[PDB]
């Protein structure tokens, strides 16, 4: 059985009466979900998986880019020198689950070994018609509204000895993060339970200690555009940029408040360029989410120091899709 490239079709449960854009997109782009999805185990079968070279990631990226280009339309966008201007109405924008399904002649293998690290053989493979429901959430640093590990935290990285490789963390227990723009109009903030978060970092350190038996440190982002130096995401059609310094500042041998700002001028994640949106809506803007994963970068430095330091990273949304699709691969059939 050999990996193959094709166009997977999406399944969803959009609602015809919704003006919310994910629903609107899914009405014409997807088909209804299967109520009784079939999953078949492959006895005495081992298969090679690679979450870092998976064409499923690449197609999903293309689709969400297409979703965004239709849904979130800025008043102005600078790509190169060409300043395109257009109507920029406020929109309802809240991700819904999307299943990716194999067309006829193809199949999707599913690694079921719970202790799978993202790359290498899997002695526990099954065939599925569709992936599980995936919310295409665009965010940086913190992965929101995603899937969870079963028993213990998972550190996935192509090689964690290489500091140039992104570290994808999957939590077992979700950490609630609530963001509010109270009734300065651009001023907002997030709330996080400090006990739940310290307990989360504890679990992450335990898994990181299996690679580095040193003092594990968490520090904040040390450079880059605002989209990646902050926890950036979208709520109520508005773009939030949240300072995560209070989340990543601890050594390892109550309530956390993250100050946020709503921005009109942003850097585009689909492609290189800036985009300007209209001023924020009045009233209250409110997002209740679950932190289910992290994107980390480990500080390099060729000294035998007594510590390893990890900072929040990301920016390449393909990594977000990767944290959900890591267990899947497409295959051609005879």
């Amino acid at each position, epitope marked *: 059985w050999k990996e193959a490239e094709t166009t997977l079709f999406c399944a969803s449960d959009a609602k015809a009466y919704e003006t919310e854009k994910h629903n609107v997109w899914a009405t014409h782009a997807c088909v209804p979900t299967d109520p009784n999805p079939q999953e078949i185990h492959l006895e005495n079968v081992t298969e090679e998986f690679n979450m870092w070279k998976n064409n499923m990631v*690449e197609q999903m*990226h*293309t689709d969400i880019i297409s979703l965004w280009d239709q849904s979130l339309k800025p008043c102005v966008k600078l790509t190169g020198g060409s300043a395109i201007t257009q109507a920029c109405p406020k929109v309802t924008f809240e991700p819904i689950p999307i299943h990716y399904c194999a067309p006829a002649g193809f199949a999707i293998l599913k690694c079921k070994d719970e202790e799978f690290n993202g790359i290498g053989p899997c002695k526990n493979v099954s065939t599925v018609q569709c992936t599980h429901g995936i919310k295409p959430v665009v965010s940086t640093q913190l992965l929101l509204n995603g899937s969870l590990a079963e028993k213990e935290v998972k550190i996935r990285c192509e090689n964690i*000895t*290489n*500091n*140039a*490789k*992104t570290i994808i963390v999957q939590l077992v227990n979700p950490v609630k993060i609530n963001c509010t723009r109270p009734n300065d109009i651009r001023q907002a903030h997030c709330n996080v339970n400090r006990t739940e978060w310290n307990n989360t970092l504890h679990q992450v350190v335990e898994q990181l200690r299996k690679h580095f038996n040193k003092t594990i440190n968490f520090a904040n*982002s*040390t*450079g*880059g*555009d605002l*989209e*990646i130096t902050t926890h950036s995401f979208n709520c109520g059609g508005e773009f939030f940029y949240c300072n995560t310094t209070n989340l990543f500042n601890s050594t390892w041998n109550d309530t956390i408040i993250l100050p946020c700002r709503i921005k009109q001028i942003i*850097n585009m994640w689909q492609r*290189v360029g800036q985009a300007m949106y209209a001023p924020p809506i009045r009233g209250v803007i409110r997002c209740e989410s679950n932190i289910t994963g992290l994107i980390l*970068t*480990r*500080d*390099g*430095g*060729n*000294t*035998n*120091s007594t*510590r390893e*330091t990890f900072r929040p*990273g990301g*920016g*390449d949304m*393909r990594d977000n899709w990767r944290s959900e699709l890591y267990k899947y691969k497409v295959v051609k059939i005879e």
Partner: antibody
Amino acid sequence: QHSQVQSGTQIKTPGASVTLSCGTSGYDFMESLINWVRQEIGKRPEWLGWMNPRGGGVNYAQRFQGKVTMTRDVSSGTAYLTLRGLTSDDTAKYYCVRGKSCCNGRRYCNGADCFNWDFEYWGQGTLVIVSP
Amino acid sequence: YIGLTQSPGTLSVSPGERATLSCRPSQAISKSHLAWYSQKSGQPPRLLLTGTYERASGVPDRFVGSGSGTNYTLTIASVEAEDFAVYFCQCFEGFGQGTKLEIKR
């Protein structure tokens, strides 16, 4: 073909800051990570950090945290290295450098996908001299 | 943390003679993650071997890389006048302290 054009020698007083530049050409600037390497005279090369021109994310070597700042101009394909709080210890040659290409035109290729550490393309180096 | 120790510090040979450089990583590493560079005065380092043995542009086959785990060697079959330089081994962000290839007298 790739060209890494670095700025000229700079003589600075202690405590001052300096900004070095690395003009790139011969490839898509967005596709490869930019690294900076320091070499003190008669000593080995020392890695300072890398920077992803897509987003501008960085990774500074531990003992240079607070010393270096890596930025870029996307339009001109120019990378920048700023050193602050200069001391005589900072007197050295500073190289701009990048690894091999892993994507000449794949759809969404990015520096983080390539192997960073096979440094085939070096700038000519910029000498910084710290003295009062 | 992967430190790299090279030996000898200075290797004196005559032209036409054989030269054996050595690099010792602090820990066991992969053959795919070790590279060699040469450096002449006034120039940046030049990449010679990208893999453990994979030569590069304009790098003649008298240069032969070898080794595994914790013992990597660079061997120059027949040293010529253009080969005298400082040689650095590398693993990720770390470089060895260097081996100076010197004219023997």
